[PDB]
Amino acid sequence: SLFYNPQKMLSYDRILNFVIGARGIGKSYAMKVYPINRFIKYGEQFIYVRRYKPELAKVSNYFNDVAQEFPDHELVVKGRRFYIDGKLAGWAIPLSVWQSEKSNAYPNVSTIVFDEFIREKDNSNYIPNEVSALLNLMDTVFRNRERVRCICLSNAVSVVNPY
DNA sequence: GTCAGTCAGTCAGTCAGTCAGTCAGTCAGTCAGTCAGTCAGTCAGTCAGTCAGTCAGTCA
Ligand SMILES: Nc1ncnc2c1ncn2[C@@H]1O[C@H](COP(=O)(O)OP(=O)(O)OP(O)(O)=S)[C@@H](O)[C@H]1O
Numbered sequence: 001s002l003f004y005n006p007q008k009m010l011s012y013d014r015i016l017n018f019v020i021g022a023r024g025i026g027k028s029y030a031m032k033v034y035p036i037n038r039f040i041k042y043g044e045q046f047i048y049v050r051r052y053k054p055e056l057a058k059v060s061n062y063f064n065d066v067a068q069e070f071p072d073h074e075l076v077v078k079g080r081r082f083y084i085d086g087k088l089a090g091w092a093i094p095l096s097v098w099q100s101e102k103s104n105a106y107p108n109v110s111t112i113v114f115d116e117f118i119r120e121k122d123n124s125n126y127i128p129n130e131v132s133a134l135l136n137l138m139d140t141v142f143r144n145r146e147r148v149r150c151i152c153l154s155n156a157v158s159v160v161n162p163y
Numbered sequence: 164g165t166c167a168g169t170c171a172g173t174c175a176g177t178c179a180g181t182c183a184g185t186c187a188g189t190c191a192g193t194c195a196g197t198c199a200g201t202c203a204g205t206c207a208g209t210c211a212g213t214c215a216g217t218c219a220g221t222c223a
Pocket residue numbers: 003004022023024025026027028029030065115
């Protein structure tokens with residue numbers, strides 16, 4: 001039809017979804033809307049992993065394209081941290097130092113709100129055995145079997161990546 | 164005892180068979196003379212910790 005449509009993805013309800021495609025074509029649109037939809041339902045905060053640190057200095061305008069989705073309530077960023085009507089929205093950090101984070105309490109998670117997990121022809125960015133790095137990330141955002149649902153999202157379809 | 168001979172040994176003659184030098188393709192051998200990926204240094208650039216400069220939340 002018109003845009004990226006996560007309805008079937010949300011429907012078939014894997015505890016861990018895995019979608020690919022639509023480079024910039026809303027593959028991030030609906031999935032950045034969804035955490036704020038959980039916030040309007042008043043659920044839990046989300047976790048935003050980043051590939052590296054400079055990628056963080058410019059990305060504070062993460063809610064610009066979801067206002068036209070939900071003009072109603074307040075969706076802003078105070079700085080590094082995201083605030084919806086002033087309540088904490090996203091725990092936003094690149095990869096380098098998640099270990100120092102992993103002793104902190106992380107009681108509230110809603111959904112995986114990152115994409116371009118893996119870039120085509122890009123392994124200089126990569127970290128050795130980062131598949132187990134995502135394992136540490138998930139177990140340090142797990143408290144039970146609930147509150148979490150994950151997605152992968154690569155720009156294109158390949159059959160060579162280790163995952 | 165002459166005329167001089169007319170059917171076997173005899174020697175003038177081969178006559179196809181014979182040995183083995185002598186070049187000879189040729190033989191893969193081979194070993195060595197040519198040549199094609201292999202790595203080390205150095206060139207440009209990616210990480211994630213510094214400096215250390217600065218608009219600004221709690222106060223004079
Ligand atoms: N529900 C929607 N309403 C309007 N536009 C949408 C919708 N879903 C997707 N889009 C389109 O998606 C675009 C932005 O999507 P993105 O968030 O960039 O997706 P993306 O594929 O992650 O690209 P990047 O690399 O993350 S910026 C918009 O400009 C629209 O063209």
